[PDB]
Amino acid sequence: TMTDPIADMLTRVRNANMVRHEKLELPASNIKKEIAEILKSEGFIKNVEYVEDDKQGVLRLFLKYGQNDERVITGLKRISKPGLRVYAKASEMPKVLNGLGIALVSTSEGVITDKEARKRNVGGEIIAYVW
Amino acid sequence: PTINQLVRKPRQSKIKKSDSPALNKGFNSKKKKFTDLNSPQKRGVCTRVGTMTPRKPNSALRKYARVRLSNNIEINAYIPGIGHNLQEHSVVLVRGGRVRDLPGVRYHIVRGALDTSGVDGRRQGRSLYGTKKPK
RNA sequence: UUAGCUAGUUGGUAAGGUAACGGCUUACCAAGGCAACGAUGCAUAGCCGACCUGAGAGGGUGAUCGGCCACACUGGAACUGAGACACGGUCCAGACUCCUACGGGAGGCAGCAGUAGGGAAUCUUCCGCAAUGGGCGAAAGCCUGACGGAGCAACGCCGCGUGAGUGAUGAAGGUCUUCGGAUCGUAAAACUCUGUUAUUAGGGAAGAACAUAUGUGUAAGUAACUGUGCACAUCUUGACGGUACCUAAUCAGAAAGCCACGGCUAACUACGUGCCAGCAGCCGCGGUAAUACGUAGGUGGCAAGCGUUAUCCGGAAUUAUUGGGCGUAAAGCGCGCGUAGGCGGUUUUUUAAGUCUGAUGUGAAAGCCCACGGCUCAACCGUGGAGGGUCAUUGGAAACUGGAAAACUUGAGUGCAGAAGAGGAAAGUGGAAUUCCAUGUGUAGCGGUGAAAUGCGCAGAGAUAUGGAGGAACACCAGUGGCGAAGGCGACUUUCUGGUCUGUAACUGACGCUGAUGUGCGAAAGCGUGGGGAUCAAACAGGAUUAGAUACCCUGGUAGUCCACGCCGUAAACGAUGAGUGCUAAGUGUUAGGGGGUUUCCCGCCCCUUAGUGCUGCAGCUAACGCAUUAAGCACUCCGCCUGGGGAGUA
RNA sequence: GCCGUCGAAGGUGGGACAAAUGAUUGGGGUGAAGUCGUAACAAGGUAGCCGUAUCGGAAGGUGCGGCUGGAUCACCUCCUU
Structure with missing residues (x-):
């Protein structure tokens, strides 16, 4: 039982910031795809790529990092x-x-x-x- | 705590207490109950004037007095200033404020309002201790 | 530390009654109703627009002012009247006060004053209807302790002047001085203008005043402005008050102090004093040279006010929704099963309750804020605007929450193969050790302290050797090793019985998590009931040490430790770390498994995957120590709890 | 005018609750350099602590179970260049 998927995605994003890895994996959702698209449109996400397998997701995103490896947020x-x-x-x-x-x-x-x-x-x- | 755990209890406070536990005066007469009448000062008849000493590290013969108040309660209060024009059966007005000499006394009378006459031995703090401006 | 309340209560019938509906009241029938989403009770309290505070959310208060409610010496009742069950109306009962011929009768200042009493403390026993508004009248006009106005308190806000300029000689004088001087200080004196305000004489007797009736003239109606009903004119009304205010003249002459000066907190010197007197909001000063007591000078703050006290808010993030924590600092109960509740996997359709959005009505006015205008300005007042709802109705949107319907499996659960385990209950078994008893052998000792002593022993101890009885836990195995939700589980065999993981993935298709109250289990000790007591061991006895030891020490020694059933129901019950879920560098092991390659055969080897079970450690986190996939990291839901110590787990 | 229902006040009775009071009494906070003994703080001189039981003028002791928040010594086993 998972109380909230948005909490999961944001914890995954922040925990990806703390170690800095371009790729991350997370079960997708329609709201998740939309907010990922807006994240890319702000400029924080380098690329977006949805995939399909049994059943949901799994949304794979490509992070972004500065030239000096500086976290944007x-x-x-x-x-x-x-x-x-x-x-x-x-x-x-x-x-x-x-x-x-x-x-x-x-x-x-x-x-x-x-x-x-x-x-x-x-x-x-x-x-x-x-x- | 969690928001619902905070909904079903009123988020209770640490309600304070008073510093003058006789700021309150009971029903004067024609009644037995004690009113919650509040005051910044109370008058009272002094049934004995005495003198006691504080604990360490201070050492001095500090002058106090027990007084019966209008609400028919028994308190203690030290007389400030140089010289005291009081004795047993003397009425007196009383202020509020604690002293660190010893407990059992947490007030002090006001000098010049009641029988307690002001001492004219001072010229700097005249507006206290009842001294009037000299010429 | 307020858990059951309610019997006209709840429902019905019928009638009565009330302006009205209504157990509102009666008679009959029924037993319901209220309550953890807090009834009832108790205690306090009128409520609100607002006021104070705060950046804001909030917190506190219900003084003026306006709205609503309740009451008029206390209790009961009703007539009048539209409207009262009536504040200055009535009757009765009750208390008080008072008159009387003693027969009986008169009143209710929580109305304005004013008076007593209480308190710390809160005021004229004022002029008058000139205006506004009330009651009545046809009106004039009447009446109105509403109200207009006057007055008292520095009670509050605001403002206001207590002179200005020139003026040094650093005058005098005071204070300090290292004895030169410095301080006060352009401060003073003096010169020149001034009059804030005051004092006099005058004016204005200002506004607020609009008017009602009264005559001229005009429209609606009547046959008839004959008369009546309608708008103008002109006549006529000030308690405030001779006010306010203004003109002219005169004088710096009438008009300034309070607190503090160690830090907080801006402002230091001398003297007196010497743990005395005293100061004190805190930290704290003072026992002979006090920048903290007192005084003098000087200085700072503030001002016709200033300080103290009480109260409230802020500071106080010190109730933390914004905005707190729970390893060690107060705070995770012992844990378990689970109700109500809170929360909710994935997708589609749909509803539009929440939500978003627009309109409509409304949120009185005064008040806060903004803008402007008027009292000489400000205060104040007015105007207008914005603002203000957890508000109702209604038009739209459907991502999200919610409702309905339809799909999925990844969560949870089941299924098939397995794995292990001190997991729980009942019984029995084996041997040793111990104890007692018996016997043979056998002597002077045995026993014990750091040294001893107590005790046992000639009735032959101990011991040795044998055999027998007793009660009690099971040697190695044993390990940071496992099981069990904790508390716990180590003797073996069986009978019955609960849990865990892996793989599988066929299967049910969200069925899940937290979880108050409730229930049960729950260490050892303790207790009720009956046995057994071999050991071990509270109380107790002896001896020894010891100034003394009823303690440790040695020798006994009862209950107890044991069993069987109940009783209680705490603990440093710990990992001082609540449960459930997801993510984030590593290496090294251990327990029960799985997949693959290496070997003729893996059983020998390696890699990979699990889950626990550890350690070292990065990021991060922490008061630091330490935590680190077995988080005290990164988040979410739910529960428990803390808001200084002692009192006190006490009453 | 009489009678009937309701009816306050009043009397009677029994309870409930609140506050003062009361001989004495128990515990607590505080005060003089009071006396006795020194258990706790280090291996506190008998380790401490937690609960319970029991003894004792008392701090306390003891017994039973538990914890380390225990030290001189030493962890089976394991980690570390």
């Missing part, structure tokens, strides 16, 4: 976790690190970065910051 975590679910309006939506970081948020029309979610004036349930 300085921290990464979620906000909406079980028990205490959270939500966020369009105006109240938080600017974490302003432009620096972004705020993944799931909306009635789909998951997008923090920006577009405040541009369109449609909020939603936040999932995880990243910075």
